[PDB]
Amino acid sequence: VSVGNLRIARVLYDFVNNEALPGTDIDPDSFWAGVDKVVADLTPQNQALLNARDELQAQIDKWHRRRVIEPIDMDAYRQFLTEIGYLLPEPDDFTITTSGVDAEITTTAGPQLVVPVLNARFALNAANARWGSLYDALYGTDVIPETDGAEKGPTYNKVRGDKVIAYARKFLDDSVPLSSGSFGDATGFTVQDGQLVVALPDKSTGLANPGQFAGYTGAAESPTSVLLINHGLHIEILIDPESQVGTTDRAGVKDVILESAITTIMDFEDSVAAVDAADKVLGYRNWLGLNKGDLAAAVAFLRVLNRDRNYTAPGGGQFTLPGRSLMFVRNVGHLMTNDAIVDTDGSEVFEGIMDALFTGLIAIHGLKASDVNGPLINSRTGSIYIVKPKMHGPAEVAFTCELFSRVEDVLGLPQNTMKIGIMDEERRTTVNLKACIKAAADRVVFINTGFLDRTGDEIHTSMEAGPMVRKGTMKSQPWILAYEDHNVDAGLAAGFSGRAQVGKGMWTMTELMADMVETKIAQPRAGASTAWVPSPTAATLHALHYHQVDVAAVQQGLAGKRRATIEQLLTIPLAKELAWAPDEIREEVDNNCQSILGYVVRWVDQGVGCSKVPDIHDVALMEDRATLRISSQLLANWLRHGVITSADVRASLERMAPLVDRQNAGDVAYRPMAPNFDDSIAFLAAQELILSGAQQPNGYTEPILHRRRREFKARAAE
Ligand SMILES: CC(C)(COP(=O)(O)OP(=O)(O)OC[C@H]1O[C@@H](n2cnc3c(N)ncnc32)[C@H](O)[C@@H]1OP(=O)(O)O)[C@@H](O)C(=O)NCCC(=O)NCCS
Numbered sequence: 216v217s218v219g220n221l222r223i224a225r226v227l228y229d230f231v232n233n234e235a236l237p238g239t240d241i242d243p244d245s246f247w248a249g250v251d252k253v254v255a256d257l258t259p260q261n262q263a264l265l266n267a268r269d270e271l272q273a274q275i276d277k278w279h280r281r282r283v284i285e286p287i288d289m290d291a292y293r294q295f296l297t298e299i300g301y302l303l304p305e306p307d308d309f310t311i312t313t314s315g316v317d318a319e320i321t322t323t324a325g326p327q328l329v330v331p332v333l334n335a336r337f338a339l340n341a342a343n344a345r346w347g348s349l350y351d352a353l354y355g356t357d358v359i360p361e362t363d364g365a366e367k368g369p370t371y372n373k374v375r376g377d378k379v380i381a382y383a384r385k386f387l388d389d390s391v392p393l394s395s396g397s398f399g400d401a402t403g404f405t406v407q408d409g410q411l412v413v414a415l416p417d418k419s420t421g422l423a424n425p426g427q428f429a430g431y432t433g434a435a436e437s438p439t440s441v442l443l444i445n446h447g448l449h450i451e452i453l454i455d456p457e458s459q460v461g462t463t464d465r466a467g468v469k470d471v472i473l474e475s476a477i478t479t480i481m482d483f484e485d486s487v488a489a490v491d492a493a494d495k496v497l498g499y500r501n502w503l504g505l506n507k508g509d510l511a512a513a514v515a516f517l518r519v520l521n522r523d524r525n526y527t528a529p530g531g532g533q534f535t536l537p538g539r540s541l542m543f544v545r546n547v548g549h550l551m552t553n554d555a556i557v558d559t560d561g562s563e564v565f566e567g568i569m570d571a572l573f574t575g576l577i578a579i580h581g582l583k584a585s586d587v588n589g590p591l592i593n594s595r596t597g598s599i600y601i602v603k604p605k606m607h608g609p610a611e612v613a614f615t616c617e618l619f620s621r622v623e624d625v626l627g628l629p630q631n632t633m634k635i636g637i638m639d640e641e642r643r644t645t646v647n648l649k650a651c652i653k654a655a656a657d658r659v660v661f662i663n664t665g666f667l668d669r670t671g672d673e674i675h676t677s678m679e680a681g682p683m684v685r686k687g688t689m690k691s692q693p694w695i696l697a698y699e700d701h702n703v704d705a706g707l708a709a710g711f712s713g714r715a716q717v718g719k720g721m722w723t724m725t726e727l728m729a730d731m732v733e734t735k736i737a738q739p740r741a742g743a744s745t746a747w748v749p750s751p752t753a754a755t756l757h758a759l760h761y762h763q764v765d766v767a768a769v770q771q772g773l774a775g776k777r778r779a780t781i782e783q784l785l786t787i788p789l790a791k792e793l794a795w796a797p798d799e800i801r802e803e804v805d806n807n808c809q810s811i812l813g814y815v816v817r818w819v820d821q822g823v824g825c826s827k828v829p830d831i832h833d834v835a836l837m838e839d840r841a842t843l844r845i846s847s848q849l850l851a852n853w854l855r856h857g858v859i860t861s862a863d864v865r866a867s868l869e870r871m872a873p874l875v876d877r878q879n880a881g882d883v884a885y886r887p888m889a890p891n892f893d894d895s896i897a898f899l900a901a902q903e904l905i906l907s908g909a910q911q912p913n914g915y916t917e918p919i920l921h922r923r924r925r926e927f928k929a930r931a932a933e
């Protein structure tokens with residue numbers, strides 16, 4: 216479909232004209248005229264920034280190569296990085312001015328959920344994860360141990376159930392305490408004189424803090440639920456003395472509901488596999504339907520978005536809390552182009568520019584509640600939140616800002632409607648973080664330590680230095696501990712408190728929920744106002760940490776400190792005279808090869824961009840591209856310095872591959888790699904990301920995955 220200078224695929228063109236544009240008050244002929252111009256005016260920069268990356272990698276590649284056996288002189292390294300304009304200066308103190316942002320980003324501290332947007336089922340559950348059942352999260356997972364004769368099964372178990380009930384009672388005791396007595400003793404709740412009254416065997420009692428009573432449902436004389444609030448997050452006690460769980464409870468408590476996933480990132484990036492116009496539109500569709508509010512998915516059940524929740528207030532008025540997680544959308548970074556719309560010469564258009572345009576325009580519908588726009592509003596303050604990933608340095612951030620500003624003109628939106636959540640997940644950003652924050656000083660809504668892509672850039676940036684530590688050891692290196700702290704320092708010194716989120720990384724062990732409750736608390740304790748979780752269940756559980764830690768306080772306590780030097784940030788995580796025994800090296804390669812084949816096989820064959828892949832210790836892991844980035848990069852490093860040979864990788868890939876078939880054997884759609892490995896696009900793709908990983912730009916895995924999936928798809932219609 217010829218438009219100005221463009222060949223827009225009809226699948227996109229139809230979608231954008233019929234589905235997306237009506238109701239936006241944007242003239243379809245003008246919209247596409249804006250598109251043409253933006254793409255034209257801004258493609259040079261996009262390539263210029265991308266070229267600037269490759270150059271810097273080569274210079275840094277040169278530098279390490281012409282230096283061996285005489286350990287890194289860290290002052291020459293730092294001077295080198297300044298000479299080439301990698302390590303740009305540090306700007307003067309400032310305060311972000313970003314306005315028009317929702318309370319749930321500026322003020323509320325709680326879990327943030329990230330879901331693949333190509334999956335309507337998970338997306339719906341994600342936006343609905345704002346509110347989650349604490350009973351289901353504890354009963355369903357290993358938080359309540361299955362031992363001591365308390366196993367779960369197809370029939371509800373009292374023994375497990377009472378452990379669940381008890382846990383939650385401790386929680387309520389710990390968070391919204393009774394004046395006197397414990398929740399585990401309650402016999403019923405009432406509301407007298409606009410105050411919560413909790414009946415006990417010995418007395419009746421209010422709350423230690425009457426201001427933690429938020430409201431209720433049903434008759435005051437005997438409510439159906441009681442609504443509480445601690446650290447700005449809501450807790451609901453569901454009452455039904457005639458329920459499966461109710462009749463077993465001293466107060467007839469049915470369930471405790473926690474306000475969990477406050478915000479959700481609807482993901483077009485590492486979570487998903489979209490390599491052409493079709494895929495692209497398919498996820499653009501889901502984003503539109505979330506923003507309209509009408510998105511539905513069949514399961515005899517239809518899954519829709521939750522409506523807002525009504526309550527009676529203490530004094531007696533009716534009010535409304537939001538039923539839905541406030542959505543961001545993660546666009547893709549500055550790297551990839553896409554089939555979707557091409558040049559006359561056949562050059563593809565940058566995917567990132569197109570996301571900004573189509574994702575921006577669609578999000579319009581999520582700011583209003585009309586007939587054309589659909590019933591549910593997302594940002595009640597009038598903002599569009601876009602997570603911008605994999606940015607390298609301040610200039611690339613400024614580019615996103617400029618891109619956003621042109622996408623605002625084209626959409627007729629007021630300037631700065633499009634807010635940017637900034638990933639801190641590339642070295643060049645990490646060492647120039649203050650500068651990145653300044654470049655988006657009027658747009659930024661968060662920073663987040665994407666430790667995973669960050670680990671990826673650490674291996675690739677420093678590819679020629681020598682052998683790296685095994686990936687399990689990365690978590691305790693100088694560079695990563697400084698980067699976490701450094702992120703929080705910079706955010707806080709930019710006045711992020713009350714204005715924007717300081718975000719931390721994802722929990723990848725989806726089955727170790729007992730671990731996550733125990734371990735992840737460290738993030739809020741480190742001052743993170745939000746952090747990333749892999750599921751609504753996880754979100755409900757992470758919620759617990761924000762009831763315990765007072766994040767706002769921790770931020771106040773941390774203000775002004777400087778817990779990281781630039782030497783700590785540039786400390787390269789090298790092996791440095793650590794000789795792994797024969798077994799270890801065979802473990803790392805084996806480990807990494809399973810994680811790769813596990814993820815890539817479902818990527819290239821099934822078009823699935825996020826998967827549960829069990830490792831060589833059989834811990835289920837949530838793998839995506841960032842995890843693939845580490846895995847492949849590390850193996851490349853070990854190859855570049857001959858810890859392994861090319862042959863070593865093959866043999867491991869070859870023995871790991873049949874195993875991933877065994878764990879995938881129950882799938883209807885799955886086609887296995889063994890025994891004929893060389894006639895398997897999947898296998899060959901995994902093999903490319905290792906044997907040619909040293910040559911991918913900044914270690915990114917998109918070039919190969921996109922090309923290999925494009926390949927597979929053609930060899931599927933043919
Ligand atoms: C990999 C994955 C398919 C594994 O699935 P699984 O846990 O083995 O199987 P299920 O999802 O059916 O587990 C049960 C429930 O978990 C929910 N779920 C799991 N991850 C979810 C996610 N992050 N968002 C919303 N719901 C999720 C499902 O909705 C499902 O309930 P349902 O019957 O109502 O659909 C899935 O968890 C996933 O895509 N990863 C999480 C997304 C993510 O965090 N990625 C970000 C990468 S940066």
Ligand SMILES: [Mg+2]
Pocket residue numbers: 485604605638640665667668669841
């Ligand atoms: Mg990332």
